[model samples]
Target: KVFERCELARTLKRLGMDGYRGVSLANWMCLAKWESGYNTRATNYNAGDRSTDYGIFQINSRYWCNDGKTPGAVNAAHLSCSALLQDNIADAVAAAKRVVRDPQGIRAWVAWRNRCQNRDVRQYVQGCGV
Candidate 1:
C-alpha cells in the first residue's frame, strides 16, 4: 500500500510513533519517506551483503527481521521479514519501535541519519494533524 504523506503521518501517530525513544514522529515520517516512500511493499536487495530491506521503514534482513539468509542475520524483531511487507503496517511499526530500543536509537536506520537527522523534518507531518 502506498500512503500519502499526511495519511502516513496520521497513521504512524496513531501507532505511537511520536517521541518513541525521544525520536519524534516527524523523524519517523522523514525516515519512511526516504526509505520506502511510505509504501508497504517496497524492498531492496543488497548485493554487498545479500540482505534485503523490507517495508515502509526498510527494516533490514541483515540485522532486524529474519529471511533464512544473510550472514549474522537475527530476528531481533521476532518477525518474518515478509511481515514487514504487509499492508496493515502494525507489525512493521512494532518492529520499528523495537529497532529504536537499541543503543543506536533512530540511527539504526541509516537513511534517517542521512535525510532526517539535523534537518527540518517537521515538513513531513506539518499538515497531517498528527
Candidate 2:
C-alpha cells in the first residue's frame, strides 16, 4: 500500500509517534520517505550481505525479523519479515520502538543516520498539521 505524505504523517501521529521518546515525527517522516517511500510492500535486498530490508521502516532480516531463508536470524520482533510488509504498521511500529530503546536509538536506521540526522524536517508535516 502507498500512502500520501500527509496521510502517513497523520497515521504516525495517531500511533503516538509524533514525539516517541526523543524521535520526532518529522524525522520519522523523513526516514520513511527515504527508506521506503511510504509503500508497505517495499523490500530491498543487500547484495553484499544477502540481507533484506522490509516495509516502511525497513526492518532488517538479519536481526529484527526472520526471512525464513536466512540462517541464524535473530528474530528480535519474534515475527516474520513479511509481517512488516503490510498496510497496517502496528507490528512495524512496535519493532521500531524496540529498536529505538536500544542505545543507538533511531540511529539504527541508516537512512535516518544518513539523511534525517540533525536536519530540520518540519516541512514533512507542514500541511498535515500533525
Candidate 3:
C-alpha cells in the first residue's frame, strides 16, 4: 500500500493546500478501494481483459490516455504513470472547475461520477457526494 499511501498523501496535500472539494476523502477512499484496491502500480495483463484496468481509479490505461508514445499509447505502465502525474485529483478538480465554474460546489464531480458509473463501472462505482 506504499504507492497508494503516497498517492493519497499527495492528493491530501493538494486538497489541503488548494481547497479541493470535488469528492470527500472517505468517498474517494471508497471509490479507490472498489476500483483498484488502492494499487497505484496495478496493470492489466492481456488486451480486452477486465483485469487490465489499473491505478487508483482503475481507468483503462489504453483507452483514456493521451500520451501518443506507445503504439496507440497502449502501454499500461506508461499510461498509469501519465494518469498519476497528469490527471491527479488536483487536475481533475481544476478541469471540473473550468467546466462548472462553481468554486464552492462539486456538481461537475457528481456528474462525472455518474457518467463514470453509467459508462465505466455500471453499478460498482456508485455516485456519491463530496
Could you say which candidate leads in TM-score? 1
CA lDDT of each prediction against the hidden true structure: 0.91, 0.87, 0.42
Residue-wise lDDT of candidate 1 within 1-130, one digit each (tens)? 9999998888888899899999898899899999998899999999998999999989999778999987888788889998999999999999999999999999988888888899998789887898
Candidate 2 matches the true fold with a TM-score of: 0.94
TM-score of each: 0.96, 0.94, 0.39
What is candidate 3's lDDT per residue for 39-68, written digit by digit as tens? 555554444443234345544434444344
Model 1, position 113, has a per-residue lDDT of 83
- Model 2, 15-124: lDDT tens digits are 88977879999998998999999998999998878889999899999888999866667878788898899899988888887778788888999778889888888888
RMSD of each: 0.9, 1.1, 9.0
Q: Is candidate 1 or candidate 3 better by TM-score?
A: 1
Candidate 3 local Cα displacement, residue 124, angstroms: 17
- CA error at residue 61 for candidate 3, angstroms: 3.0
Q: What are the runs in model 2 whose C-alpha is more than 4 Å off? A: none
